[PDB]
Design a binder for this molecule. Structure first.
Ligand SMILES: Cc1ncc(C[n+]2csc(CCOP(=O)(O)OP(=O)(O)O)c2C)c(N)n1
Ligand SMILES: Cc1ncc(C[n+]2csc(CCOP(=O)(O)OP(=O)(O)O)c2C)c(N)n1
Ligand code: NA
Ligand code: NA
Lengths: 525, 524
């Protein structure tokens, strides 16, 4: 037995049998003898590697294993880690290191002070002090990433470690289970029941950990038991509730003053599975309406600690909601009434309007499609127009780090081969993760990649207009041909200029079993 | 006066008037009122932004200014910082931060613990404690990046700072000069002279800081003064010596046993402007030949401290070399004789060999072309076949981080518009920095981008053989059409399958003033 055999035994028994990577010489001794029951997914750039792994871990509900090259490979993946942090993504990131005797002299490919490199975007990082501790360190990595609050971890491994003999006692590691006890106490449950049942007009607010914990159906039961509306917490990264349910109200605005206005008539706000709150725009005002109280249920002690208001309970979301639904009384206030349907937009005679594209998607897509969205000026219209009825149907970068979309679509589609993934990606956002197209071609992962091509960084032009700034450089992205780029990376590509051409292209893509890129020139104002 | 007006005044007076960036909302208050005498170079991904700035700083010999978005933009640029670290590149990296009152709550776009993010790849990192300290902190960043050993620094700026009034006393900052005194003392100089003059058979070994300090001509003078051969230090990132000068001996192998074998006959080794040594492959053996001594001249205290052998002198390389050339006595030993030229490789009639491509480059390229190389299995052949006569003629990623090549070619070409830049890039390496093609097209930066397309991560096949690994996944890169990708980003693109087709494409590219991508299918 070697450090190598012991390590692959640990990965197999813990279920980490898909490796997302881009290889280098320090990693070859790990990749040696790669087992026939494991799968390796090559990305051409590490931002795409990490984002594929992120999508895979989130959609599968299991940890994902990554293998990168030394400091430059780790570095190229670091933007993608910002999103993985706020999505509570359990990524086990390994990077290969020089031989131990060559690290201090700073030989070429030595990753200097390796554990510091990924900080502060990892929950744990190490470089084992000896070859013999590597298998236990890898066990520690997997169980740190997969415990609440879940998140990325990092391990740097000198390449001469793998061939060394495994130590006595290593046989205990592969079978280890780490379980998290997160049910409320009887007193804690009583407090939630008393406060909710006593409220005049409560409201529900739901974040990405409602989807991550598979609590969507429980959230519907909760809303119905208290006859209350349900919103998505601001800066939404996942969809936690069926969007045409009559209690649904949309996504809250990412603004201090905006949330206290939207929720002004409610005496009690219950936030589940989000921070309080991922505000974005500067909009000073009241954190809460006068007389309103807030309750917060979260899996993350740091979310509970940092909130500017409310009483928090930190624990297991699905067990907490199940207990709460059981313990609450029925209510006979009237049921909330549904939001009105979105009207078609006016025909203006220029390029296709995003609203039009979305109406077509809502008509032709399967009702359990999965959407991966990274198109920053069209978010409001998408949520209004594209129904998302089932869990696990939406992914948007949780840190707002662009380059998530194309790679995450490939990883999500790999995790959920029985559903169809449709990416809705801007011309700007596409270029941060463009080589994911190639991985989709090579492995025949049949994402429908829709590129909305408006010629600009539209969301930034909007924000610039708001600040009366007209002199900022760098906001336009002319001269891009995504059909040529798609074909370059091996993906069947088509340009759709009208509503009829777009419908035909989407229909034909959905009917097939290959990736397709659909380039859609769109209106921007 | 505002923090904004004072900061642009500092950048202007210090000479940082080109901004390399990718914008975001936290940066819009900085980019507001961008001055007419500044230039903004947009990159579509931050790895390319930082690589362009890196090339520009190295080729211009001046610091370069970067503006990135928050933590995700900073993160996307961090692979490029590995290279900037080992090339001693003076990059001033700014990243926009949320409004100060929204940082601790972790609002969307808050960069948490920002100064820790780029570590350990920056020599100084800060987030100012108040708006009034932003101008002085920017000055500190500039003067930290540009003092020996030069390197990247990082400043995180909350976006509500820019509009605030500038503090009293700010007017002293823009004019500040920071000079480095780095000449050897009389005793230090005499020790080098005494030792070198007493040696039986000295040898010279030169690294990237010889090119960086503009000491190439002095290195030739020194070699000639001691009638000694000259090598490039291993893991070469720049070219410090004219490669057809008769004392030139090529690049040392990146191997412990290799160096002591190559240099076996020399009693004294003088290493200038490189670490001792950037070994790569694991080839254990003797650090030095028995009886040999090593002298080291470096601009970097860390290089001096970490070396496993030798006596080091840390200071100003160009000033130290000039003092040494002046002080050395006459030497009567015969001059070294030139290396024999490379033999032709016989064409087997099918896909082109890289050696053939390099012979055509050597025939047709201007004799002061600049090469940006990131083609990992073809480095030895390149150095054997493509003459580099002038300073500032070669750039290869100093940390080996791929994605340097396409972006750095663009930045070098921007720094040196009077010379012509030829990028020599593999099919694997191109994809880590591919959006640099777009910036070349948009700004009409006329790089000749040559893509060597062998279908594989060729150098990893070599290392797999060395390490005795035969079943590793992920070594092949089939199914890439770089003419389609080039055209997609706006660059005129042509495929060249034969020696004649490549000559014609290279000649036409060189005769024009637009960027061109030339895709060349090659044998491994
Ligand atoms: C890595 C990274 N760099 C820069 C930004 C800043 N950013 C925010 S929105 C945006 C524009 C995206 O444009 P596009 O995807 O074309 O969508 P549109 O706004 O045009 O709808 C940019 C560049 C970011 N969020 N992430
Ligand atoms: C960012 C990064 N990721 C991975 C590697 C590992 N790496 C070393 S050489 C190499 C292959 C480069 O292939 P190519 O540019 O096609 O050149 P060839 O070896 O085929 O001549 C790779 C992937 C690296 N050095 N940098
Ligand atoms: Na756009
Ligand atoms: Na290659």
């Amino acid at each position: 037995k070697t450090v190598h055999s012991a390590s692959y035994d640990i990965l197999r028994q813990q279920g980490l049998t898909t490796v997302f990577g881009n290889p280098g010489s320090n990693e070859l001794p790990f990749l040696k003898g790669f087992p026939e029951d494991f799968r390796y997914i090559l990305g051409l750039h590490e931002g795409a590697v990490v984002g594929m792994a992120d999508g895979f871990a989130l959609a599968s509900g299991q940890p994902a294993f990554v293998n990168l090259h030394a400091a430059a490979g780790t570095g190229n993946g670091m933007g993608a880690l910002t999103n993985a942090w706020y999505s509570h993504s359990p990524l086990v990131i390994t990077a290969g290191q020089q031989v131990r005797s060559m690290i201090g002299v700073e030989a070429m490919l030595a990753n200097v002070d390796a554990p510091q490199l990924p900080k502060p975007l990892v929950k744990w990082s190490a470089e084992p002090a000896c070859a013999e501790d590597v298998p236990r360190a890898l066990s520690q990595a997997i169980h740190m990433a997969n415990q609440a609050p879940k998140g990325p971890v990092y391990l740097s491994i000198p390449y001469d470690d793998w061939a060394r003999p495994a130590p006595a006692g290593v046989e205990h590691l592969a079978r280890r289970q780490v379980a998290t006890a997160g049910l409320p106490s009887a007193a804690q449950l009583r407090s939630l029941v008393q406060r909710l049942a006593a409220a005049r007009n409560p409201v529900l607010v739901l974040g990405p950990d409602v989807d991550g914990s598979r609590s969507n159906h429980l959230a519907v039961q909760l809303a119905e038991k208290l006859r209350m509306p349900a919103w998505v917490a601001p800066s939404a990264s996942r969809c936690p509730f069926p969007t045409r349910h009559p209690s649904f109200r949309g996504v809250l605005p990412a603004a201090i003053a905006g949330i206290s206005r939207c929720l002004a008539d409610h005496d009690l706000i219950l936030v589940v599975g989000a921070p309080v709150f991922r505000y974005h725009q500067f909009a000073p005002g009241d954190y809460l309406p006068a007389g309103t109280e807030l309750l917060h249920i979260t899996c993350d002690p740091g979310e509970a600690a940092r909130a500017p208001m409310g009483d928090a309970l930190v624990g297991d979301i699905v067990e907490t909601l199940q207990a709460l639904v059981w313990a609450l009384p029925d209510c006979d206030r009237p049921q909330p009434q549904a939001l009105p349907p979105a009207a078609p937009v006016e025909e203006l005679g220029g390029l296709l309007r995003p609203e039009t594209v979305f109406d077509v998607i809502d008509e032709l897509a399967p009702k359990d499609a999965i959407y991966v969205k990274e198109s920053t000026s069209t978010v409001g219209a998408f949520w209004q127009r594209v129904e998302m009825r089932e869990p696990g149907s939406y992914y948007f970068p949780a840190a707002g780090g662009l380059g998530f979309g194309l790679p995450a679509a490939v990883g999500v589609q790999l995790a959920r081969p029985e559903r169809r993934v449709i990416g809705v990606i801007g011309d700007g956002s596409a270029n941060y993760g463009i080589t994911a197209l190639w991985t989709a071609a090579q492995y025949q992962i049949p994402v429908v990649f829709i590129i909305l091509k408006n010629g600009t960084y539209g969301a930034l032009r909007w924000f610039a207009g708001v600040l009366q700034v007209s002199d900022a450089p760098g906001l336009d992205v002319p001269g891009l041909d995504f059909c040529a780029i798609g074909r370059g990376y091996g993906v069947h590509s088509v340009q759709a200029n009208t509503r009829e051409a777009f419908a035909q292209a989407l229909s034909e893509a959905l009917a097939g079993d290959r990736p397709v890129l659909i380039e859609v020139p769109t209106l921007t104002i």
